[PDB]
Amino acid sequence: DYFQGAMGSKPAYSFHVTADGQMQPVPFPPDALIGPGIPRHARQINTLNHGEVVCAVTISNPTRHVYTGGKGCVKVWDISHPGNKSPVSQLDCLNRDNYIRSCKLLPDGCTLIVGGEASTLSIWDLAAPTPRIKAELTSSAPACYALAISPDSKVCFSCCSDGNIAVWDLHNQTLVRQFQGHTDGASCIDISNDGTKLWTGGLDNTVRSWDLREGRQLQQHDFTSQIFSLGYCPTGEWLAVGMESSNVEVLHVNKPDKYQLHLHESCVLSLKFAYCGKWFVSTGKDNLLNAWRTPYGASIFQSKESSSVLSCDISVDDKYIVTGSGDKKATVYEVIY
């Protein structure tokens, strides 16, 4: 084995909430904490010394580079050369005093879209030398807090600080649609597994679903605190939402029941589903990276970092997790099965 499982336990932290107010501690099925495609643990394998708080992180496909968004720039790190201590590239994106908030790779790996605390989204050509700026999208919203790319690669969705969701046609750099609804900043975003619906979370305490074909708001979920992060299960049915209250809420899509998960002491700043959908991670201001079984939230592993964990990503094969830190670095983990 090399590392072996060892069971721990906690006061009940995972609850099923039925249509009424009723809250029952989840009795875990036999494959809650162990099974095919379920991690046994995670091993830190690199530290990427950005030197500014890492508010955004993404990993290439194939996994060989990591992109860290800090203050004004994205740094590019070659993790397939374990001895490297500095970036191989740096992408100067915003004013040196403005934070990057999101960075997304197009499905084919040739292009990076970057947004943050500024009106412009920068589009980067990653085909060699020399990553270069290919285009800019200029919004009239003061900031971008989150990005999502359509599965066909044609459109970029930007969560604006005024609560609007901008829809950008990437080919001609035109804002083709705007989803209006959120009455404070839109903080996070994902697309449904069938690609037909958008899901967004807000600093107005709502989660909203939107029809991508018609453009109209479909559902609204009102919470008692602000939403910072969200993720749609890639095999369907479940939406996980990270709350300022410290909860993760796992909403049963279209249905009145949910799971409430309590393993953070502060705001849940980021979350991400594994590509297989069977598990996800959440990160907190309390320094924890939590791994959770889908949907009911059995705790698969926890890693306590040195500082707030602001952002995360998981590689396309579910083999690596990258986290961005308030200690001005990113961490690369290998997921051990």
Binding site: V53, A143, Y145, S187
Partner: peptide, 9 residues
């Protein structure tokens, strides 16, 4: 509305 400085400090 939240800037990163608000979130951190």
């Amino acid at each position: 509305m939240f800037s990163i400085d608000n979130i951190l400090a």
